[PDB]
Design a protein around this nucleic acid. Structure first.
Ligand code: A2G
Ligand code: MG
Ligand code: MG
Ligand code: MG
Ligand code: MG
Ligand code: MG
Ligand code: MG
Ligand code: MG
Ligand code: MG
Ligand code: MG
Ligand code: MG
Ligand code: MG
Ligand code: MG
Ligand code: MG
Ligand code: MG
Ligand code: MG
Ligand code: MG
Ligand code: MG
Ligand code: MG
Ligand code: MG
Ligand code: MG
Ligand code: MG
Ligand code: MG
Ligand code: MG
Ligand code: MG
Ligand code: MG
Ligand code: MG
Ligand code: MG
Ligand code: MG
Ligand code: MG
Ligand code: MG
Ligand code: MG
Ligand code: MG
Ligand code: MG
Ligand code: MG
Ligand code: MG
Ligand code: MG
Ligand code: MG
Ligand code: MG
Ligand code: MG
Ligand code: MG
Ligand code: MG
Ligand code: MG
Ligand code: MG
Ligand code: MG
Ligand code: MG
Ligand code: MG
Ligand code: MG
Ligand code: MG
Ligand code: MG
Ligand code: MG
Ligand code: MG
Ligand code: MG
Ligand code: MG
Lengths: 271, 93, 19, 46
RNA sequence: GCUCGCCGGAAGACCAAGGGUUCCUGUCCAACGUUAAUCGGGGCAGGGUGAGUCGACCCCUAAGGCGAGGCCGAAAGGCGUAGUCGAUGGGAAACAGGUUAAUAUUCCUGUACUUGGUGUUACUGCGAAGGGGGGACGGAGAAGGCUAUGUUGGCCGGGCGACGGUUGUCCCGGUUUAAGCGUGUAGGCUGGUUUUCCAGGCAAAUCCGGAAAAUCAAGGCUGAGGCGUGAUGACGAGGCACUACGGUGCUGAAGCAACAAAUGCCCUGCUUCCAGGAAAAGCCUCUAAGCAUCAGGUAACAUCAAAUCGUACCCCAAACCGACACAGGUGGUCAGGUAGAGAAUACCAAGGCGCUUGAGAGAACUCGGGUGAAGGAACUAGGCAAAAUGGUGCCGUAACUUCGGGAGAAGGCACGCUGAUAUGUAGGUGAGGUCCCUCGCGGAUGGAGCUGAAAUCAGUCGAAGAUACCAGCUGGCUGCAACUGUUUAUUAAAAACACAGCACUGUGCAAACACGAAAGUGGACGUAUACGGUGUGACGCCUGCCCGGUGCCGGAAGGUUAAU
RNA sequence: AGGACCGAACCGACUAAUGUUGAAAAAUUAGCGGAUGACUUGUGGCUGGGGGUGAAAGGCCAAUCAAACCGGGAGAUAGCU
């Protein structure tokens, strides 16, 4: 549910929060927890390589099953859990052989519902089939790009992929970007849409809320001195330059894709 | 078992002071200057073998040497180890 | 002789600006 | 006011100590220069 | 030595860090000490730091470091795997009393506890670098039960007052006791137990996970405090004996209760929220290879071991960082009384100090304060500074508004003390006794004692009752920025920066992008509801016309055009 | 509940006076802002000089910053004093 906060303080007036009451209020499943210490957008040289990363809430990593290899064995969803590592909610599922795993929580999937992966899996949300066993026109998520590698396409809140055409050993996929891309027919997808579609309706409301999620302030180029950024300088607000990145590359329409290796798999771009 | 050669090199001197005198007449304890590398066990072996008395427990501390001046030339005395050696009820040294 | 001079220290008054 | 020298023996030894110098060729060249000059104290270690 | 003054959430006490003998004693006063100095953190000499339990070392990991091979790089080197280091975190155990000129959870006395080795005896499935459990974790809020601790009464010892009164509802002091061991309480969590099977837990598993019966519903885990013991002891106000007037020897009363009560404990709990809250070992359990009346395991008893290094002293400071015995800086711990909401503030206690030049004088002028006739912003760039406002309860409260606000708007009234209501009320607390009882640290009834607001009525003192300290000035019009934030360490705090929100644009994942000759790494263990870049800057209403120029994106008939 | 309100500790630094061979190479005194957060603080770690880091002031990077410090090229060069 999308609920608007009352304007009791100025920092709460604009806050819009996604209150999902079907989420596990208790602690997560310990066996599938790892530590992931923060980077601050700094690489192994200790240099900031991605700006605007730092601080925010301590987060444990949930080992999410993106592969869905455990096929032929039925699985029941125990509970939907909050995952701080991603926009999607995750489902704790118990297979009939005792093993528990986390999966991306698809739209509609609740506790009690049964999921199953493999070639002979049923065509319902949660179930993960090889995409040659999925009908054309179907809506799928957690789509593999190489057979066995695990889902890389359409993992974020309310995202999904349409199987538009099957040709030989390949299928054509309309991605959320609007891109028509070919993938190997063998590549596994999970049917449905990734849940928590109300994720984009949230309004952080105040500066601090961004600082909680680990985003540090963006300082505009035009607010700087010439030495710092091409947009730097001027007496008062000046510009008179073609908008560029901090490193001089034009930033208002200039295509930066340079991958002739994967061009063959692109049927049509977003444009 | 420790060699007599080693047991003859760990006791340097009896330590003479009011606290040593008081300890010897109050808590039947002898205060010894010992080798800086000597252990409580080696002190408890050496006193028993060289003074023919029965030792209850050895307590040790390291005395840090003082920084002294001799003709406006700075110098430092050596660190030494002090052993508080508690004898039994009736032994005497 | 003369001692090594001091690095800059706080100044009580601004130099007058003549322009 | 807080001044620039805030002593910590651990930081001192890790930053400037004998083993820190020995760890790199440039650090070993420091020791070589200081021995060549005939310093009584090669490093902060003492 | 007496008095006076000052601090007392410190200017007291205990530490870490840092320093390193500054500690204690004797002796000296050249220099050092902003003066003198007989004194000193100064000179000189001697002394002083005692640990199985405190800390380090040690076992274990975090960030991060190093890194066999390895990948990469003109060389130097870079990165990183297995590993191995790395606390600021996890991991066994000691308390009270006494003692030194100077150490003490370290010495002594009393009473404890922990871990491992060895031996004996009984009984026995033991075994890991592997599996599972556990360790193991957030913010906020709330309430109950408690203790530290305080107050008062009782009790005991002493007192009868330099000046009116003071044998009483009088005055002063004391009224302390630990770990451990036993008990298992307020509270918190969870349904036990048995059998059978199993695509899971790199193999196995009696363990964990899952499934299916059956029976019983009360079993287990956790837990402050209290109580008992520890303790016929220790401590103990004072008094009897020696005083080398520093301090030794000797004996020893009461040692209870009630009430109040933490920010400490139960509580790593409970409730709730979104921003979703280390790791690894010790520990517990499971088996594998292997070992089979052996090794090894469990329990009791006995014996042995627990090394090494730190331990003085300062530590909001004259000993650390500031060249100084420098009005600065410096993390943690302890937290008495009266008033008070309080760790504010005032005055005190314990304890510690009077800040290492003094003596006079009582000019101008400077500094820091107090008061001021009449006037009241006339001052001035500007009410700068100052003056003023200031508490609690009740009443009352505008435009405007995003309906929260604005608001403590503004403004008005009351306030001390005494008595009564009521020899102390409402409320809180709760003994004895009675009754029940699965019989105890229980339940119900019971209101002795204790504590105790607030209000009303009446009276009464002062110029003034919020009396001190403490403690909003208020209102109106308007620019800018929505807001809380951030900034020029050291002349700028703002209208600047950021900001949620908005838009454009890039980016299909070996992403764009960034750091890097490279390997790699960040982006992200993320995947277009995502990520980068850019501009704009909450919200509301909106965001028009122009694609010639310069970018960018796309097209391609020809023209020209590189190496070759 | 809250980047909510009043207000100590704590963090800061708006105004004034003092001080300016200072008590102090940035303070003191009286007022002042924040004070559950985009908070503050201890310990340790990482980022290195055309480089870092920067809620952006050319700020900060050991009392040094429109290119740190130290040594070297080095007796740079100086139609200038
Ligand atoms: C002192 O002079 C320096 C220049 O030498 C600066 O201007 C500084 O701001 C001055 N300070 C004062 C108080 O005028
Ligand atoms: Mg960014
Ligand atoms: Mg932005
Ligand atoms: Mg600027
Ligand atoms: Mg430029
Ligand atoms: Mg202009
Ligand atoms: Mg112009
Ligand atoms: Mg002992
Ligand atoms: Mg010792
Ligand atoms: Mg001359
Ligand atoms: Mg000395
Ligand atoms: Mg002294
Ligand atoms: Mg003198
Ligand atoms: Mg001295
Ligand atoms: Mg590591
Ligand atoms: Mg190598
Ligand atoms: Mg390496
Ligand atoms: Mg280690
Ligand atoms: Mg530590
Ligand atoms: Mg002492
Ligand atoms: Mg009590
Ligand atoms: Mg508190
Ligand atoms: Mg001490
Ligand atoms: Mg000082
Ligand atoms: Mg002084
Ligand atoms: Mg402080
Ligand atoms: Mg005070
Ligand atoms: Mg005068
Ligand atoms: Mg005056
Ligand atoms: Mg006045
Ligand atoms: Mg007047
Ligand atoms: Mg008047
Ligand atoms: Mg008037
Ligand atoms: Mg005027
Ligand atoms: Mg005038
Ligand atoms: Mg004023
Ligand atoms: Mg005033
Ligand atoms: Mg105007
Ligand atoms: Mg603003
Ligand atoms: Mg502000
Ligand atoms: Mg400034
Ligand atoms: Mg300023
Ligand atoms: Mg990568
Ligand atoms: Mg702007
Ligand atoms: Mg606030
Ligand atoms: Mg600042
Ligand atoms: Mg002030
Ligand atoms: Mg405020
Ligand atoms: Mg405040
Ligand atoms: Mg400028
Ligand atoms: Mg500087
Ligand atoms: Mg330059
Ligand atoms: Mg030359
Ligand atoms: Mg020259």
């Amino acid at each position: 549910a999308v609920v608007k906060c009352k304007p009791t303080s100025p920092g709460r007036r604009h806050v819009v929060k996604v209150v999902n009451p079907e989420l596990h209020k208790g602690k997560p499943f310990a066996p599938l927890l790892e530590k992931n210490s923060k980077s601050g957008g700094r690489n192994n040289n200790g240099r900031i390589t991605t700006r605007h990363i730092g601080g925010g809430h301590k987060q444990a990593y949930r080992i999410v099953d993106f592969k869905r290899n455990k096929d032929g064995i039925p699985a029941v969803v125990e509970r939907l859990e909050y995952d701080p590592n991603r926009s999607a909610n995750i489902a704790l599922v118990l297979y009939k052989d005792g093993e528990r795993r986390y999966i991306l929580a698809p739209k509609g999937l609740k506790a009690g519902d049964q999921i199953q992966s493999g070639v002979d899996a049923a065509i319902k949300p949660g179930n993960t089939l090889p995409m040659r066993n999925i009908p054309v026109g179907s809506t799928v998520h957690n789509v593999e790009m190489k057979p066995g590698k695990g889902g890389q396409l359409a993992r974020s809140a309310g995202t999904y992929v349409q199987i538009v055409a099957r040709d030989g050993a390949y299928v054509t996929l309309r991605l959320r970007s609007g891109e028509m891309r070919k993938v190997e027919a063998d590549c596994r997808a999970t049917l449905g849409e990734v849940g928590n579609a109300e994720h984009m309706l949230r309004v952080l409301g105040k500066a601090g809320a961004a600082r909680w999620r680990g985003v540090r302030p963006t300082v505009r180029g035009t607010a700087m001195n010439p030495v710092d950024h091409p947009h730097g300088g001027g007496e008062g607000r000046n510009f008179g330059k073609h908008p560029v990145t901090p490193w001089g590359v034009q930033t208002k329409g200039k295509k930066t894709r340079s991958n002739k290796r994967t061009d063959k798999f692109i049927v049509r771009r977003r444009s | 078992m420790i060699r007599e050669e080693r047991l003859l090199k760990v006791l340097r001197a009896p330590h003479v002071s009011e606290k040593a005198s008081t300890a010897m007449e109050k808590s039947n304890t002898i205060v010894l200057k010992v080798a800086k590398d000597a252990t409580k066990a080696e002190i408890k072996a050496a006193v028993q073998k060289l003074f023919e008395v029965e030792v209850e427990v050895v307590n040790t501390l390291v005395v840090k040497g003082k920084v002294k001046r001799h003709g406006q030339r700075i110098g430092r005395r050596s660190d030494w180890k002090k052993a508080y050696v508690t004898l039994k009820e009736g032994q005497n040294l | 002789g003369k001692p090594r001079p001091y690095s800059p220290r706080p100044t009580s008054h601004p130099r007058p600006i003549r322009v | 006011m807080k001044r620039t020298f805030q002593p910590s023996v651990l930081k001192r030894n890790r930053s400037h100590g004998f083993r820190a110098r020995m760890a790199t060729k440039n650090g070993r060249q420091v020791l070589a220069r200081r021995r060549a000059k005939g310093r009584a104290r090669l490093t902060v270690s003492k």
